[PDB]
């Protein structure tokens, strides 16, 4: 039951949102019709290396649908300070700058 990565283009459906304890939920839609596939998602501080920071909490996010523009929700645990949410792979990956306060725990 292991799916390949979703390699088509993602689009944020709304601005990512901070939860009570300082994680971030991220809703995206997927242009591909090649589901089922796994949504690539991470936090990074350096877009030129993509070294992961924080944690992906929804660690098996599966698009099951093959209709275009289907929607999926992710949750990540950002590091304190500034970072980027990174969804998708390749040249069409999308990023969103994020700031987590030291007090938001």
């Amino acid at each position, epitope marked *: 039951v292991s799916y390949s990565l979703c390699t088509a283009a993602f689009t944020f459906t709304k601005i990512p949102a901070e939860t009570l304890h300082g994680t971030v939920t991220v809703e995206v839609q997927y242009a591909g019709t090649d589901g089922p596939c796994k949504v*690539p*998602a991470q936090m990074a501080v*350096d877009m*030129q*290396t993509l*070294t*992961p920071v924080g944690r992906l909490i929804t660690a098996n996010p599966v698009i099951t649908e093959s209709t275009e523009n289907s929607k999926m929700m992710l949750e990540l645990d950002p590091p304190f*300070g500034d970072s980027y949410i990174v969804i998708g792979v390749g040249e069409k990956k999308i990023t969103h700058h994020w700031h987590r306060s030291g007090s938001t725990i």
Partner: antibody, heavy 119, light 114 residues
């Protein structure tokens, strides 16, 4: 063309401090993290840390978090590394490096400053 | 910190030989979220700064000849030079960038028998 200009040498007394400079050109200085790496003569490579010139954010190897301080001057496209309490094992070449792991830009390491710890 | 181990520490090869160098990590460098291996290879010729050869375990830096190939996944990686040239005299380092701090292997020094 990416260029990272570093002074050739610094002579430093045992236990003293030195400030190294790295002047960047040929790419957008503020939008690339600047990394620093240590290499003792005849030995391997040790990653010191990195700084983001636009924000000033830093990420240090804990081994270097007390003895190294990274700063930048955006107006002169210059990155700086101050190293303190130099030991005889800190006689080494210190590189600044624009790490770039993507198709549309060049990774580039400067020529390094040779730091000699001696009285 | 991730521990990177390279073997052999030195190797003696002839011009035209296909040379393979190994790099092992203490935990997987394959990030399941994007299926990328966070492993780079550097070349350092005598008296020069390191130069990036390979990133993502197998992607060549621009301008690097295709005689250099990176392979492997997870904890086990190799750099291959398909037919060694005299100019390839150098120390080769692998470096994980899966976690900060970045860490390097101890290098493989390539010496040339002639």
């Amino acid at each position: 063309q990416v260029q990272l200009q570093q002074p050739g040498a610094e002579l430093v007394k045992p236990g003293a401090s030195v400030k190294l400079s790295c002047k960047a050109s040929g790419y957008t200085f503020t939008s690339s993290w600047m990394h620093w790496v240590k290499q003792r003569p005849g030995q391997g490579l040790e990653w010191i840390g990195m700084i983001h010139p636009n924000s000033g954010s830093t990420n240090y190897n804990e081994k270097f978090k007390n003895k190294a301080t990274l700063t930048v001057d955006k107006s002169s496209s210059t990155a700086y590394m101050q190293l303190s309490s130099l030991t005889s094992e800190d006689s080494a070449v210190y590189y600044c490096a624009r790490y770039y792991y993507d198709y549309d830009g060049m990774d580039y390491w400067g020529q390094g400053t040779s730091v000699t710890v001696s009285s | 910190d991730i521990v990177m181990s390279q073997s052999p520490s030195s190797l003696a090869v002839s011009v035209g030989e296909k040379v393979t160098m190994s790099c092992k990590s203490s935990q997987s460098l394959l990030y399941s979220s994007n299926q990328k291996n966070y492993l780079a290879w550097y070349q350092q010729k005598p008296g020069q700064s390191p130069k990036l050869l390979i990133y993502w375990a197998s992607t060549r830096e621009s301008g690097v000849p295709d005689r250099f190939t990176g392979s492997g996944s997870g904890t086990d990686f190799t750099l291959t030079i398909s037919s060694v040239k005299a100019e390839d005299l150098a120390v080769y380092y692998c470096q994980q960038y899966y976690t900060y701090p970045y860490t390097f292997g101890g290098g493989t020094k390539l010496e040339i028998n002639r």
